[PDB]
Amino acid sequence: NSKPFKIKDITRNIRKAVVATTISEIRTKVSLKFERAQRRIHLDCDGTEVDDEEYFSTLEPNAELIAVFPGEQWRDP
């Protein structure tokens, strides 16, 4: 294995952290942390979507993520 991760909402005002070993785990825990359903994980810096375990395994510890929920889109600045 597990690693720490930072996840924010798209406006970057809700700033939270999760410990996870798989993308399935991070998604469940991010829903519990944000109290919102069907989290989609994107990179904070560039909006890249993380939707397979292979790319999730390449992520560094304490990588900065954005949680984009249904009806939302990742925002740039």
Residue numbers in the entry: 117 to 193
Task: Recite the paper's sentences.
The cell-death-inducing DFF45-like effector (CIDE) domain is a protein-interaction module comprising ∼80 amino acids and was initially identified in several apoptotic nucleases and their regulators. DREP3 is a CIDE-domain-containing protein in Drosophila and has been suggested to be a regulator of nucleases. Unlike proteins harbouring the CIDE domain at the N-terminus, the DREP3 CIDE domain is located in the middle of the protein.
To further understand this dynamic protein-interaction module, we obtained a crystal of the DREP3 CIDE domain which had a calculated Matthews coefficient (V M) of 2.76 Å3 Da−1, corresponding to a solvent content of 55.43%, and solved the structure at a resolution of 3.0 Å. The final model contained residues 117–193 for all nine molecules.
